[PDB]
Scaffold this active site. Sequence first.
Site, PDB file in Angstrom:
ATOM      1  CG  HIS A   1      30.978  -6.664  -1.106  1.00 17.64           C
ATOM      2  ND1 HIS A   1      31.257  -5.698  -1.933  1.00 17.64           N
ATOM      3  CD2 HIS A   1      31.924  -6.032  -0.723  1.00 17.64           C
ATOM      4  CE1 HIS A   1      32.605  -4.527  -1.135  1.00 17.64           C
ATOM      5  NE2 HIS A   1      32.616  -4.774  -0.552  1.00 17.64           N
TER       6      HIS A   1
ATOM      7  CG  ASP B   1      29.912  -5.179  -5.335  1.00 17.70           C
ATOM      8  OD1 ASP B   1      29.322  -5.226  -4.242  1.00 17.70           O
ATOM      9  OD2 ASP B   1      31.073  -4.826  -4.748  1.00 17.70           O
TER      10      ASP B   1
ATOM     11  CB  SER C   1      34.131  -2.542   0.594  1.00 14.45           C
ATOM     12  OG  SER C   1      35.015  -2.721   0.071  1.00 14.45           O
ATOM     13  N   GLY C   2      31.992  -0.060  -0.936  1.00 14.37           N
ATOM     14  CA  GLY C   2      30.865   0.342  -0.230  1.00 14.37           C
ATOM     15  C   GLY C   2      31.008   2.006  -0.703  1.00 14.37           C
TER      16      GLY C   2
HETATM   17  C1  LIG Z   1      39.386 -10.064  -5.192  1.00 11.35           C
HETATM   18  C2  LIG Z   1      38.912  -9.498  -4.384  1.00 11.35           C
HETATM   19  C3  LIG Z   1      38.027 -10.676  -4.149  1.00 11.35           C
HETATM   20  O1  LIG Z   1      38.151 -11.108  -3.629  1.00 11.35           O
HETATM   21  N1  LIG Z   1      36.559 -10.530  -4.679  1.00 11.35           N
HETATM   22  C4  LIG Z   1      36.561 -10.265  -6.274  1.00 11.35           C
HETATM   23  C5  LIG Z   1      35.915 -10.582  -7.404  1.00 11.35           C
HETATM   24  O2  LIG Z   1      34.549 -11.451  -6.715  1.00 11.35           O
HETATM   25  C6  LIG Z   1      34.924 -12.538  -5.987  1.00 11.35           C
HETATM   26  C7  LIG Z   1      35.794 -11.854  -4.429  1.00 11.35           C
HETATM   27  N2  LIG Z   1      39.230  -9.419  -2.665  1.00 11.35           N
HETATM   28  C8  LIG Z   1      40.667  -9.866  -2.342  1.00 11.35           C
HETATM   29  C9  LIG Z   1      40.248  -9.606  -0.928  1.00 11.35           C
HETATM   30  C10 LIG Z   1      39.793  -7.649  -1.379  1.00 11.35           C
HETATM   31  N3  LIG Z   1      39.224  -7.083  -0.618  1.00 11.35           N
HETATM   32  S1  LIG Z   1      39.526  -5.766   0.387  1.00 11.35           S
HETATM   33  O3  LIG Z   1      40.912  -5.338   0.651  1.00 11.35           O
HETATM   34  O4  LIG Z   1      38.696  -5.403   1.747  1.00 11.35           O
HETATM   35  C11 LIG Z   1      39.321  -4.769  -0.681  1.00 11.35           C
HETATM   36  C12 LIG Z   1      40.035  -4.055  -1.202  1.00 11.35           C
HETATM   37  C13 LIG Z   1      40.076  -2.605  -2.640  1.00 11.35           C
HETATM   38  C14 LIG Z   1      40.943  -2.322  -3.163  1.00 11.35           C
HETATM   39  C15 LIG Z   1      40.933  -1.668  -3.776  1.00 11.35           C
HETATM   40  C16 LIG Z   1      39.592  -1.599  -4.184  1.00 11.35           C
HETATM   41 CL1  LIG Z   1      38.699  -0.038  -4.609  1.00 11.35          CL
HETATM   42  S2  LIG Z   1      39.011  -2.481  -3.016  1.00 11.35           S
HETATM   43  C17 LIG Z   1      38.989  -8.319  -2.385  1.00 11.35           C
HETATM   44  O5  LIG Z   1      38.357  -7.161  -2.489  1.00 11.35           O
END
Ligand SMILES: C[C@@H](C(=O)N1CCOCC1)N1CC[C@H](NS(=O)(=O)/C=C/c2ccc(Cl)s2)C1=O
Lengths: 234, 52
Positions: free
Chosen positions: A42, A88, A185-186
Amino acid sequence: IVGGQECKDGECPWQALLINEENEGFCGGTILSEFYILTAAHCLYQAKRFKVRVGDRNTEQEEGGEAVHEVEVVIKHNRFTKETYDFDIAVLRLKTPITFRMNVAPACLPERDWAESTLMTQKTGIVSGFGRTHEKGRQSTRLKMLEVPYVDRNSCKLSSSFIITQNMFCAGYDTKQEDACQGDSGGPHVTRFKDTYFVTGIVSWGEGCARKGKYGIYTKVTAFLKWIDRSMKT
Amino acid sequence: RKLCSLDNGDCDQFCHEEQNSVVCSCARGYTLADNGKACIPTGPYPCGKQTL
Ligand SMILES: C[C@@H](C(=O)N1CCOCC1)N1CC[C@H](NS(=O)(=O)/C=C/c2ccc(Cl)s2)C1=O
């Protein structure tokens, strides 16, 4: 990273940072060897052109260990889907080899069965990165790390508003204010065994960061060890 | 708790049960020591070690 502590000198040497055209970190990665970085598929949609920085613990100062590498090949899992973040996973081949040194060394790739029976049944793993220190905040200029308990698979599925596939696992805390976050992420999830650190996960997604009754979701590296090995052979 | 289930079979790293016997092995960049249990880094900056 929310909570946890700074990586002190030499403690997180497998951390890589994907940097955009503005030299800003947008995603982490794990050093696998002198030519290859492990990251999330991603992350490859968060920049048009990016390079990989290694050796950096404090992005505000030049400590001398840092090195920027250009990417030669991007190998994304062909089954990655944005709808669920299933599969992913991606591997990067660098144009030039990484020079290992203080703060720059690879994490070990484990064997599948042993990692599933022995690493993933450990109490905790460690997640690290330059991401936000609170859900709403800015990225850390300091590399941080955090011990994250492995979470029972049932409990995680119960807790989650989105499907948890077999290519994922959950780690972190029900209520305690400690989690990975945006920009992490990653990055690496590693598990320590007898003073050796093995790649067990890739920071993937979460419903915000450190929310109550929500956990961090990680790509299950053990599901992809053959895939990784193949990707690194060409 | 037998073999690999008993303290990782005394192995430093990977443990497998072959025939009815513990068999140890190591990550790339390590070699298995003469006792067939310990893992010895083959050169500088072995994987999985914090840098000192
Ligand atoms: C639920 C998910 C999301 O948008 N998805 C998940 C399932 O696939 C479709 C989209 N989501 C909501 C926003 C969020 N983005 S983020 O805040 O950058 C990450 C944060 C993380 C917290 C803990 C880990 Cl491991 S990383 C995130 O990843």
